[PDB]
Design an enzyme around this catalytic site. Structure first.
Site, PDB file in Angstrom:
ATOM      1  N   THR B 191     -13.894   9.687 -23.063  1.00 20.22           N
ATOM      2  CA  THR B 191     -12.475   9.857 -22.790  1.00 20.22           C
ATOM      3  C   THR B 191     -12.251  11.084 -21.918  1.00 20.22           C
ATOM      4  OG1 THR B 191     -10.266   9.987 -23.809  1.00 20.22           O
ATOM      5  CG2 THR B 191     -12.018  11.211 -24.866  1.00 20.22           C
ATOM      6  N   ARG B 192     -11.062  11.119 -21.316  1.00 15.27           N
ATOM      7  CA  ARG B 192     -10.575  12.318 -20.645  1.00 15.27           C
ATOM      8  C   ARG B 192      -9.092  12.529 -20.955  1.00 15.27           C
ATOM      9  NH1 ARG B 192     -11.345  12.810 -14.697  1.00 15.27           N
ATOM     10  NH2 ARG B 192     -10.891  10.553 -14.675  1.00 15.27           N
ATOM     11  N   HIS B 196      -4.628   8.185 -28.546  1.00 13.25           N
ATOM     12  CA  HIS B 196      -3.452   7.372 -28.949  1.00 13.25           C
ATOM     13  C   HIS B 196      -3.917   6.407 -30.056  1.00 13.25           C
ATOM     14  CE1 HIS B 196      -4.778   4.090 -26.390  1.00 13.25           C
ATOM     15  NE2 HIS B 196      -4.708   4.864 -25.310  1.00 13.25           N
ATOM     16  N   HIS B 199      -6.922   4.076 -29.220  1.00 16.39           N
ATOM     17  CA  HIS B 199      -8.251   4.743 -29.245  1.00 16.39           C
ATOM     18  C   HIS B 199      -8.779   4.736 -30.683  1.00 16.39           C
ATOM     19  CE1 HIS B 199      -7.886   5.523 -25.154  1.00 16.39           C
ATOM     20  NE2 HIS B 199      -7.442   6.779 -25.164  1.00 16.39           N
ATOM     21  N   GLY B 284     -14.253  -0.026 -21.869  1.00 14.96           N
ATOM     22  CA  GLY B 284     -12.926  -0.530 -21.704  1.00 14.96           C
ATOM     23  C   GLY B 284     -12.721  -1.161 -20.355  1.00 14.96           C
ATOM     24  N   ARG B 285     -11.454  -1.386 -19.994  1.00 11.09           N
ATOM     25  CA  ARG B 285     -11.122  -2.048 -18.700  1.00 11.09           C
ATOM     26  C   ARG B 285     -11.027  -1.018 -17.568  1.00 11.09           C
ATOM     27  NH1 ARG B 285      -9.319  -5.817 -22.366  1.00 11.09           N
ATOM     28  NH2 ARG B 285     -11.408  -6.496 -22.999  1.00 11.09           N
ATOM     29  N   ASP B 286     -11.428  -1.416 -16.353  1.00 12.83           N
ATOM     30  CA  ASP B 286     -11.387  -0.531 -15.155  1.00 12.83           C
ATOM     31  C   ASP B 286     -12.148   0.769 -15.443  1.00 12.83           C
ATOM     32  OD1 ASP B 286      -9.605  -2.332 -13.583  1.00 12.83           O
ATOM     33  OD2 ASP B 286      -8.107  -1.711 -15.067  1.00 12.83           O
ATOM     34  N   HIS B 287     -13.343   0.665 -16.032  1.00 16.91           N
ATOM     35  CA  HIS B 287     -14.125   1.874 -16.401  1.00 16.91           C
ATOM     36  C   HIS B 287     -14.722   2.541 -15.155  1.00 16.91           C
ATOM     37  CE1 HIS B 287     -17.372   4.023 -18.826  1.00 16.91           C
ATOM     38  NE2 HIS B 287     -17.777   4.097 -17.557  1.00 16.91           N
TER      39      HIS B 287
END
Ligand SMILES: [Zn+2]
Ligand SMILES: [Zn+2]
Lengths: 382, 382
Positions: B191-192, B196, B199, B284-287
């Site tokens: 993560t960056r 939420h 997560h 996840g998506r668009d990693h």
């Protein structure tokens, strides 16, 4: 997988219109035997194949086999004895005779009497119920039976009047309904109470690995304080409308008098649900058991002795609503102490409503509560 | 399973105290080459084994192999080129020389130069990033590199000053930490941003099939508007304290400059997490992808070409909070229309806080919000 009826084939013992016609014209030449309501229900479940492969009441060798092995002589799982009892005075018939079984003044079934036999009441009771304590309802009912059991095949002429016939689909109908919706796997969820969030959690949890859910309220004797069956049905109709996608759920009733045999009865319930077309059967804690007789997981452990049952029992791990996580969770992922935890109890939620309290919505969907409250009295007075 | 370091063994290229001592006494007799900060970080990841089996910057045959196959010459998966570039003017050294790599006026590493080679910038860019559009940040950075790449092994003398050294555990430390807690399977969550509910849902969902969770914030360049890294760390510390059982989670940072290579970079991130000791890697998506270059599931699909990677990627199905179900749900079990659905977006939640709004608690744990708000400015101004 594909669900096959217990024994290979769905029993149909309903009488032709020609048989029902003549029987009632010639009824005075047939011995009449009075039966209890529970038995008249057993007879509709036989006729409609809910008890496949049974075609009537058990004969002596089968009864002994069911007591000792919970299997029929041919080794097929069968765990609850389906028997007709008469006293010496009530026995106005012999082996080979055709008799009529009456509930009140209504002829419910004709029966070809194959065998009239005796039994040891103390063995019956101890083996079925795991106790010979008279305080156990089932042991008390066993001790009250007539001295003679009567085996043989039946044909259903009339059935006890049912207010919810519209919901009481027989196994041939539920099978065709599953097939129409394209469900190959189906999970049975049995209940006698209104749905709480815990119930919904399990059913939607099953939806992840099964095509559809078959919610199967049991219609039976009502203790004073229970929800009326109308209430359970309407509440479930409200739940599905408001919280379930449309092609995931089927709601149909079945009539059945609980014997409170504990684990021995969970096998029977799985066999009935298999006959309805189910591939999977949710089993909870203390299933069909009477407090201080059977363990909470006892009704789960018994399926180990029935690998051949061909319906898959589903056991879920413990879970509870957490008021800090704000979610249904489990111990492994929630570290919060006991005051944040709410375990689901159909009984505690019922007593709330009886005491004039509003269940929190982490216990009961707003719309479900409003449906229950829409009845002037949602509880049985008798 | 057991997590083995990429290539079999964890690299250690830290210099002995005897080497660092003499180097700085004799530094005037070593050619100095200036490096960017991203490169000085690459050098600490090499030295501490985060980039195992690399022991320095890639030589020509390895670079070509990584571009064409995302594998090293010996066929081991390797997808992101780790290279040192110099211009003609900056090249004050030859093959065989030992040079010092300086970040500003700090000597970060010594390097045994094995090979000085050229490359086609357009091939580099198109093959790594799948595009030669200069609008792509990585293509623009590729086009700005020096004409010469320099291969050879390094030894780390000094590292860029890190404010969160206390959280930056190297792979030998995280492995020993996993072993101390008895974790055999470990899932990495990269993560960056602040956590939420989405997560937390994924991490606790992984907890059902894995022993522990390794949350791994990446420290890198900050766009104006991002959360300060201090904020991400404190927010996660608040989350774990208040919502996680104590022996399920490990939080350590790693320093790494994103190349925005999309799916090619997801493989690199999995290799780094494997080197830390992980057995599983949430994707996840668009990693690590840049909008309008890589597909959302592209970074999942690439793992099909790396069966031998020996770290298990975990892909989760779509989910969203439902304001009528009052729960994180999915389409299969929720029938409600779009206004009841809240999809989790770390960006939307950040913009909320930037705009002075309170995120609903189905987006952000109360205590996490209060931690963020405890900073006078939780966002980077530069
Ligand atoms: Zn909790
Ligand atoms: Zn919903």
């Amino acid at each position: 997988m594909v669900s096959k009826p217990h024994g290979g084939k769905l029993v149909n013992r309903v009488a032709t219109e020609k048989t029902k016609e003549k029987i009632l014209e010639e009824q005075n030449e047939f011995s009449k035997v009075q039966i209890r309501e529970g038995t008249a229900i057993d007879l509709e479940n036989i006729a409609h194949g809910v008890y496949s492969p049974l075609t009537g009441f058990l004969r002596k060798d089968e009864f002994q086999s069911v007591l000792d092995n919970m299997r029929l002589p041919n080794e097929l799982p069968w765990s609850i004895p389906i028997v007709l009892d008469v006293t010496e005075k009530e026995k106005n018939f012999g082996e080979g005779d055709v008799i009529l079984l009456y509930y009140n003044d209504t002829p419910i079934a004709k029966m070809q009497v194959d065998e009239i036999y005796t039994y040891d009441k103390k063995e019956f009771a101890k083996k079925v119920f795991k106790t010979d304590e008279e305080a156990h309802p089932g042991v008390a009912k066993t001790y009250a039976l007539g001295e003679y059991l009567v085996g043989g095949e039946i044909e259903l002429l009339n059935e006890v009047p049912n207010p919810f016939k519209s919901h009481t689909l027989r196994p041939v109908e539920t099978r065709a309904l599953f097939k129409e919706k394209g469900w190959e796997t189906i999970v049975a969820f049995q209940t006698r109470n209104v749905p709480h969030l815990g119930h919904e959690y399990l059913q939607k949890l099953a939806l992840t690995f099964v095509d559809g859910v078959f919610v199967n309220p049991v219609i039976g004797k009502k203790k004073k304080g229970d929800y009326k069956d109308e209430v359970i049905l309407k509440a479930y109709e409200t739940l599905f409308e408001h919280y379930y996608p449309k092609d995931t759920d089927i709601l149909a009733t079945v009539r059945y008098e609980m014997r409170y045999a504990g684990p021995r009865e969970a096998i029977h319930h799985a066999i009935m649900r298999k006959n309805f077309g189910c591939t999977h059967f949710i089993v909870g804690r203390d299933h069909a058991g009477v407090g201080d007789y059977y363990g909470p997981y006892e009704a789960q452990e018994i399926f180990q002795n029935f690998p051949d049952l061909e319906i898959s029992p589903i056991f879920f791990r413990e879970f509870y609503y957490c008021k800090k996580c704000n979610a249904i969770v489990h111990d492994r992922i929630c570290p919060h102490t006991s005051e944040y935890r709410e375990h689901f109890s159909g009984t505690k939620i019922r007593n709330m409503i009886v005491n004039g309290e509003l269940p929190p919505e982490y216990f009961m969907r707003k719309e479900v509560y409003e449906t229950i409250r829409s009845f002037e009295n949602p509880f049985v007075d008798e």
